[PDB]
């Protein structure tokens, strides 16, 4: 059976979706610890605009806590609690 | 089932060297970490190494570095702890532990120990000699007898009843150290009098460190 | 390095109690921080055995009447309804950094009912008193409290500086102790009296217990 | 409200999961048209292993037909029924 | 190059009944593809109006009752429920590719009840004679169907080759059309002649149906 | 969202006549504008497309190297330059948008210019009456020899409109145009209520109202 132009259109237009996000690239800088789980869901911005001058971004976001193992390799562990950017509106915008 | 069986300890003089085993079964000791953790007579626990067994990463207590080495034979599913330098103060039972993964940095199956006894003096057996009721008969239909164990070095003494089938109400007493530094202990065991004339009760000692391995019989005279 | 202080050293209390051991690490690390403490149960001579992983987590067959919290530096071990298997010492350790390291421990004994000592005495075996020396041996079997004393009467002479005890640990089944008290003469002095006896005081004796015999 | 690690660990572990992806990815050859929408919603594989030599990969695939606005820019446009992959079952393999 | 051809090329339908157009590529397209083509409705003297965009999709303001549908070489487009208004001819459009084409059309006439016409006669202005020009018009009004006979009748002598006729579009609220005949002589064949007549034949006449005027 | 052409006209063969349309309510910048033709009785034929922003173009293969098309984005405009006209070219042509780059349909249209290319001369019409005289009149206005088309005519300025036929024209044997427009009102209110005609022939500057009274 065959997805209708008009339902992947809307299915697939600009808005918050649950994305698996690794913490590495939240926490660009740090160079202590790994984390498990490496990546967290996090409601996010995400799809298309239909038009190459505009980009899918948060007009609204939020905190949300999490606890993560913070691993030391070779050292020790433990769970701290660590703060996550969400989004829950999102529009399409100039570049 | 997964399991840790240590292995290698006993008397040393001070200055001299020994070296522990730990054989694993029911996982690989490749995938995860192998601790060394000891305790001294009455005391607490000391972690005293690690290794990461596929590259080999070592990390000791500053109060064993540069006199005690850990190493893991992956092929053989063993780990060891060479323990050189040895002074009074390392007398202890030696535990093999594992973490449960490179990610688990708590130790979740132990090894039953080793002794280890750093000591100048030398190894004697023990004499056994019987414990026998005073009496035959009795007000409350019970007996007690044993095996007083007398004179060893270093510990430990095993003891059991009847070859291990007579364990309900066996105590076996700590070991206690007398004037001359040899040990000594006794094991008791209650039994109905009544029994007594027709059932016979042995006590079986084991000291390893000396080889003796002795049975004794205990009845009344 | 980590240091963890533990507490309380020992305790005693009794079947179904609540249970709280606590641990707490010398270095300031905050509240945000948790799960870095494992729990062990050890019994006399036995392995230290894993109860509860990172803070709060239940190891795998390990009763349900143990639990785990904290955070920051303090930790608690919790038994919810204390059984007289529960009879061990009971060590935290810390794996936020290595070298990792242990608590000093807590001995818990299971605080029961009273039960008065049933008192044996053994002459020496023949075969001692050949080589020369004669030990005689009190047993004082299943008792509760701990404490206890034992006084060796020698031809009604009361005796000190020759003898020397030994008890059990508490016994994980009923709570109890034994105790041995072991009189040890040379053959010479041995022989020189006739009637040795053990006196035997216990709270849960109205009045004190003596058992002896007489040489021959 | 701070979210428990079990549940982290267990709603970020390996698993198929609504993924947008951008259309001109999944046909890299396809310079000729522009699509519209630019990307589709996919179920694919996400999600962490935790252990570095382990990732996320399907084990069980499925096609599923759209479809799409393409649109060759100075010349016309239709829609063209485009097909995709779909990951139904993953788990995490040696890699 | 892609020629679109349409059809029917005309058709007649009452009011209320489902009407159906087709459009269909020249060009080899497999019924994957769709969405190509737009659909106009163009009234008389006006320009076209989109109704239908990508095949099958309703533009803003469009009356409901119309749709389209198709793939491949092959597109409808639908009136569901016919109305008055309608008449007009539809054009389909393809933007497959560039040029962009359209169909050829198709003339939809609104079939209704019969209605005969009423007649009416006109003799020349006093004005357009002293520019020496006498125009006779006849007047045809709101009747259906469109065929209909327009006969000059001058002194009783039947006209042939002095006249033309005209005819409105359909009416986009009544659904009739109306006729002119116009008769052109000189003033010099006009002045000598005395009764002018039109006589009017249709299907909802009974029978002819003459007007006629005498010059004075 | 409207277009307005304008600058058709009568023009000659072999010459020259530029169209324009003038966009209201959107940028010519974001879209395609497209001119479409009609020749009188025919169908929709395509004539030429611009892509504002860069210029742009593409042609129909009977025009090409004859027309040009071309947008000014400042005034909003697009132009039909039309060069080296034939009779067949004559038209009437429109411009339509697509309502953006993305659209190949073409959404807004303007209402049309006509061309007319022949070698015949501009001609107003005369105007005359058709009068009644027998609850029901007919009346109307005769509007004869004219060149080249349209002619509009409305009734009393524009407030009569029910009943009103205005016929098309035909072409009469001497190359000129001819039509009638009538209208039919209660005979009842003609001695009273007056009927005039407004007939305008743009392509003459002829704007005249005649007056339509039974004798
Ligand atoms: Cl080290």
Same mark, same amino acid.
């Given at each position: 059976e065959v997805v209708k132009f008009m339902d992947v259109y809307q299915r697939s237009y600009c808005h918050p979706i649950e994305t698996l996000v690794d913490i590495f690239q939240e926490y660009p800088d740090e160079?202590?610890?790994?984390?498990?789980?490496?990546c967290v869901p996090?409601?996010?911005?995400?799809?298309?605009?239909?038009?190459?001058?505009?980009?899918?971004?948060?007009?609204?976001?939020?905190?949300?806590?999490?606890?993560?193992?913070?691993?030391?390799?070779?050292?020790?562990?433990?769970?701290?609690?660590?703060?996550?950017?969400?989004?829950?509106?999102?529009?399409?915008?100039?570049? | 089932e997964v399991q840790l069986v240590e292995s290698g300890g006993g008397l040393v003089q001070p200055g001299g060297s020994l070296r522990l085993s730990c054989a694993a079964s029911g996982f690989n000791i490749k995938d995860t970490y192998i601790h060394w953790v000891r305790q001294a007579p009455?005391?607490?626990?000391?972690?005293?190494?690690?290794?990461?067994?596929?590259?080999?990463?070592?990390?000791?207590?500053?109060?064993?570095?540069?006199?005690?080495?850990?190493?893991?034979?992956?092929?053989?599913?063993?780990?060891?702890?060479?323990?050189?330098?040895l002074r009074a103060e390392d007398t202890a039972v030696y535990y093999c532990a594992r973490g449960g993964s490179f990610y688990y940095y708590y130790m979740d199956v132990w090894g039953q120990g080793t002794l280890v006894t750093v000591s100048s003096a030398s190894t004697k057996?023990?004499?056994?000699?019987?414990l026998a009721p005073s009496s035959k008969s009795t007000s409350g239909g019970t007996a007690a007898l044993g095996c007083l164990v007398k004179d060893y070095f270093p510990e430990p003494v095993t003891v059991s009843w009847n070859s291990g089938a007579?364990? /309900?109400?066996?105590? #076996?007493?700590?070991?206690?150290?007398?004037?001359?530094?040899?040990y $000594?202990?006794?094991? +008791?065991?209650?039994?109905?009098? /009544?029994?007594?004339? #027709?059932?016979?009760?042995?006590?079986?000692?084991?000291?390893?460190? $000396?080889?003796?391995? +002795?049975?004794?019989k205990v009845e009344p005279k | 390095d980590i240091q963890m202080t533990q507490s309380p050293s020992s305790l005693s209390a009794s079947v179904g109690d609540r249970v709280t051991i606590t641990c707490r690490a010398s270095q300031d690390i905050p509240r945000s921080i948790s799960g870095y403490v494992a729990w062990?149960?050890?019994?006399?001579?036995?392995?230290?055995?894993?109860?509860?992983?990172?803070?709060?987590?239940?190891?795998?067959?390990?009763?349900?009447?143990?639990?785990?919290?904290?955070?920051?530096?303090?930790?608690?071990?919790?038994?919810?309804?204390?059984?007289?298997?529960?009879?061990?010492?009971?060590?935290?350790?810390?794996?936020?950094?290595?070298?990792?390291?242990?608590?000093?421990?807590?001995?818990?004994?299971?605080?029961?009912?009273?039960?008065?000592?049933?008192?044996f005495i053994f002459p020496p075996s023949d075969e001692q008193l050949k080589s020369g020396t004669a030990s005689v041996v009190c047993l004082l079997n299943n008792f509760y409290p701990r404490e206890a004393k034992?006084?060796?009467?020698?031809?009604?002479?009361?005796?000190?500086?020759?003898?020397?005890?030994?008890?059990?640990?508490?016994?994980?089944?009923?709570?109890?102790?034994?105790?041995?008290?072991?009189?040890?003469?040379?053959?010479?002095?041995?022989?020189?009296?006739?009637?040795?006896?053990?006196?035997?005081?216990?709270?849960?004796?109205?009045?004190?217990?003596?058992?002896?015999?007489?040489?021959?």
């Open positions: 160079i202590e610890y790994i984390f498990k789980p490496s996090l409601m996010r911005c995400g799809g298309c605009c239909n038009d190459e001058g505009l980009e899918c971004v948060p007009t609204e976001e939020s905190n949300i806590t999490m606890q993560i193992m913070r691993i030391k390799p070779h050292q020790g562990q433990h769970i701290g609690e660590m703060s996550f950017l969400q989004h829950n509106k999102c529009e399409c915008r100039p570049k | 009455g005391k607490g626990l000391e972690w005293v190494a690690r290794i990461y067994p596929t590259n080999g990463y070592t990390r000791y207590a500053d109060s064993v570095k540069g006199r005690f080495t850990i190493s893991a034979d992956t092929s053989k599913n063993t780990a060891y702890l060479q323990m050189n330098s057996g023990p004499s056994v000699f019987p007579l364990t /309900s109400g066996v105590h #076996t007493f700590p070991a206690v150290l007398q004037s001359s530094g040899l $000594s202990l006794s094991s +008791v065991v209650t039994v109905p009098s /009544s029994s007594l004339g #027709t059932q016979t009760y042995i006590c079986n000692v084991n000291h390893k460190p $000396s080889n003796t391995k +002795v049975d004794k | 062990y149960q050890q019994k006399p001579g036995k392995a230290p055995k894993l109860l509860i992983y990172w803070g709060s987590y239940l190891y795998s067959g390990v009763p349900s009447r143990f639990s785990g919290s904290g955070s920051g530096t303090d930790f608690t071990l919790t038994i919810s309804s204390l059984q007289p298997e529960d009879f061990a010492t009971y060590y935290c350790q810390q794996h936020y950094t290595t070298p990792p390291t242990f608590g000093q421990g807590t001995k818990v004994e299971i605080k029961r009912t009273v039960a008065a000592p049933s008192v034992v006084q060796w009467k020698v031809d009604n002479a009361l005796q000190s500086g020759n003898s020397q005890e030994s008890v059990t640990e508490q016994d994980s089944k009923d709570s109890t102790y034994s105790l041995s008290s072991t009189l040890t003469l040379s053959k010479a002095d041995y022989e020189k009296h006739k009637v040795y006896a053990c006196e035997v005081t216990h709270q849960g004796l109205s009045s004190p217990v003596t058992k002896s015999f007489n040489r021959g």
